[PDB]
Design a protein around this ligand. Sequence first.
Ligand SMILES: OC[C@H]1O[C@H](OC[C@H]2O[C@H](OC[C@H]3O[C@H](OC[C@H]4O[C@H](O)[C@H](O)[C@@H](O)[C@@H]4O)[C@H](O)[C@@H](O)[C@@H]3O)[C@H](O)[C@@H](O)[C@@H]2O)[C@H](O)[C@@H](O)[C@@H]1O
Ligand SMILES: [Ca+2]
Length: 1064
Amino acid sequence: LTGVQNIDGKKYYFDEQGHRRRNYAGVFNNEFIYFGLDGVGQSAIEYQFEKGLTSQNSVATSHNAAKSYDTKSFTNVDGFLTANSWYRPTDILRNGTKWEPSTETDFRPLLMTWWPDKEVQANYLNYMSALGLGDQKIYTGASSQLDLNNAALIVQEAIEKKISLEKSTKWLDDSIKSFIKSKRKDIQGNLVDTNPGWTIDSETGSTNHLQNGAFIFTNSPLVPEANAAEGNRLINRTPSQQTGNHISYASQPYSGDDWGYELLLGNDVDNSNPIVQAEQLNWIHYLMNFGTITAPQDPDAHLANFDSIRIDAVDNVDADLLQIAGDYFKAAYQVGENDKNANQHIHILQDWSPNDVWYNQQVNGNSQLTMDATMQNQLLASLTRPITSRDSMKSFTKDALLVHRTADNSYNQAVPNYSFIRAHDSEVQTIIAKIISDKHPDLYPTVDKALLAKDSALYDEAFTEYNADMQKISSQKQYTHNNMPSAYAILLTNKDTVPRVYYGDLFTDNGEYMANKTPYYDAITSLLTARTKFVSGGQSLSVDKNDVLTSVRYGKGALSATDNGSSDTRNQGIGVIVSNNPNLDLNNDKVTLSMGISHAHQAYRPLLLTNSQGIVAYATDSEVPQNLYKTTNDKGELTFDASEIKGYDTVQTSGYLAVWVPVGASDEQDARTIASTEKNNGNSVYHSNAALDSQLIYEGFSNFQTVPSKNASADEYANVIIAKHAADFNKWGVTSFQMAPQYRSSTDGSFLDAVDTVQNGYAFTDRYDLGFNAADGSKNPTKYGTDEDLRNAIKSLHAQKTYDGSSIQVMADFVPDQLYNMPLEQAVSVIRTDKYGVNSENPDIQNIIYAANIKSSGTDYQSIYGGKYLAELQKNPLFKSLFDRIQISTKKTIDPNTRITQWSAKYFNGSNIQGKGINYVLKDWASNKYFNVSSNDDMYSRLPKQLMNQESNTGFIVDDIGVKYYSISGYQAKNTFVEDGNGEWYYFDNDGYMVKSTEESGPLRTVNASSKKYYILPNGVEIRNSFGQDIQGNTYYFDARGEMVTSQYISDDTQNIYYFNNDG
Ligand SMILES: OC[C@H]1O[C@H](OC[C@H]2O[C@H](OC[C@H]3O[C@H](OC[C@H]4O[C@H](O)[C@H](O)[C@@H](O)[C@@H]4O)[C@H](O)[C@@H](O)[C@@H]3O)[C@H](O)[C@@H](O)[C@@H]2O)[C@H](O)[C@@H](O)[C@@H]1O
Ligand SMILES: [Ca+2]
């Protein structure tokens, strides 16, 4: 059978293929039929909407009309209304039994007396009915307007009685907010959001962001105060892309890739805005003078200042900031003059992209130290990986390493760098999340998915496993790093690098600060003090035929194996042996430590050695038994037998580790070198040399440190423990103490940093608040301590003095990228995007108005200190070059003339998706304009006419000329689409009349001079997800938006494909 058929008094269409069709329109045997989803024909002549209007004027609309139309009587966001708007009516139905004038505090939720369409009204009624206040009747969007209105009166009676009983409306804010986010069962049987336009479910777009979605803020004439200047909101200005275009600075062996992207986390700060760039400078000046600024009455306030900064998230922010900072330290502390001044202020980059190393060198001029990621990645791959996945030791002599150490024999050649093995983030968090995954596949089956979980009970569980696996032998380490002391032994003996030690190597990553040691503490703290006494001179790496790494330092004064050295050489210069093979069987093969010829016929003793029991550590010459002493031959070589070196499997080593030092060193002996005072002509601020290698960084925190409970004793707080243990860090050779960010944390759980169990300080609302006491004067700390406790930690570290007589530096975590959890809402124009700022191309969310949490309180410490010192600094001659500098990305100078005391949306690139819902800002569907109460401009819609006690009618009205529609608010449809409760779409033209196709002008129609073609029946029904037949017999398809498809193949329900060409 083909064509039109009556099967059981019902019309069906069978195509020319014989297939029964659904969602097909056409003129068949001179009759216009629409085969709906059923596959059943409906008459495309007969109107499908209930004809008629109902007045929204009631006996009660005179009373429930707003007393004042002005902002006073409406809660609002910059004049706009949201679903959580409350308003003051003229009268209150007090206790459900009398109309009384409203007082100044008699506000009620807008949603008690007005809804944006009938379906929301229906759902509200059934929900308030679930709480016992509403009627049993179960009204739907299908039920009549008049019934819904009367039911809202019965609900209102019940609300008012409850309010009179409580003498409070707080319970109603609670219940309406819960209604707005409510879920319900459906026909499918799955839970769905009741009100999708008011939840994250409507915020659909790209998932490529840490928080599953992003907005870019853009300008729009509806919102004057959130609009940025022209040439601001620059995106993705990484060091590689700072100019506007990617630039590889890398040469033949090395990569010049960029892994950056602007929108990382939170609310994204526009660091391309010159006023923001000035406020970033002001914040650095505040940190570098924190003591003198916060405790002016303390005579020692000048000892409680920070000395250096680490730049955080370098790949995510405008790279102009690196120059701004590098200028400040030249202006303030003359770091450009010589190594002596440079090395007193050691800054570091979190520069993960391979190109950044070379950007830093060529453009940056080394104002901050790059990380050696090639060293980190190689130490991990060759030793820490379990046996299956492990690289050969021979990889340490490869070409792709940043600093070749096989033949390093000179100063001022290597790129100045810091190298490390682990970070608060790097190689800690990922391991925990994998444990969560391997224990709970039901919640997070893929490893990446496990990262994101915030449950306190999930971390506690994952950590008892993590801690237990760290105690296991290397062959049974399922998650923890193997060979950790072997890695630290290479790192701490290497030349031309500033090593950084992670807190969580020495201590447990979780629990009380400094309270529990790792299995590695003895090995690593031995190496740290030994570095101070022996590690100096040139270096060489080798690997013998058995893959045994031998790293040698020749001692101060000697730069190669054939160098005779100075008087300092003899008792300096360590040698290290590492194997990564648990079954190493040397047999007849010999391992050789070739110390220098400067070290011929010389007694050596062990610092570290591997047993089956673990690693033995000898702290002095006299702790070594005399048979373990070994003397070098005439060439300066030590030789080892299978009786000494074999494969091991302990907690601390897969393979072998040994460290040998020359006998007879004094206790006065320090291997470190004083910084040069000679003037530096070079582009770089730092130089890789003996004085710089004398430095060492200690990352003094972990994410998963337990957070001192509300009534914690004074000595749980980490900054107090730091002050106690100040001498221990100096003993370890620490010259730069990298503290945690000290900023008051968010507790909201938008991210892992924002979790109340681990409030690390990277998630903050008020950058200037380092734990100042509360308003009442009660002590109110951060995770680490009060402002007092911080100032005292800084003084204790400053009181410690290193080998050159200078203080131990204290480093601030400089975090310019984002702000979290801002208190006030602002209207903003948004586009849905991914993390790169690429338009996710959602039609519904293009330049729409959103109520974003994006405005600071204006009573915070930002409001006190923000831009405060820019007036002072501009007047200082030393800072002239900073303020006159043309920045790379902006091509303008910094703008210190405006102060930022309240953050506003105009200073942000964008934000993560906040889950308010697209239609959270309220809007009349007929006029398609937003409500605004602060303005009577024509771009905004006036209040719904009922609320201003005017005549108001809603529904469809047939007329001698055509069909008009009025919304629930009482306004006429003009130049919009309108969905009926039946599910059908219609369109209304400029004249305010429904578009209907005619015999003379067929169903395929452009409507809005938009070049977009739709299919409209004689009903006025605009068909969607459907096929449309022409009078000529041509067939077109119309997508989910109703738009005609062109040059494209459409797939069908039954897997049938039709490919429609351009225009037809
Ligand atoms: O202030 C916000 C945060 O600041 C710090 O973190 C900043 C950086 O966070 C991430 O970097 C961590 C990540 O870096 C490397 O990831 C390697 C990946 O590189 C590519 O994409 C590659 O193609 C991938 O295969 C590979 O996985 C490290 O090796 C890894 O260990 C680290 O986890 C961002 O990605 C960076 O762009 C940011 O600059 C601070 O640590 C955070 O806690 C703060 O919240
Ligand atoms: Ca940014």
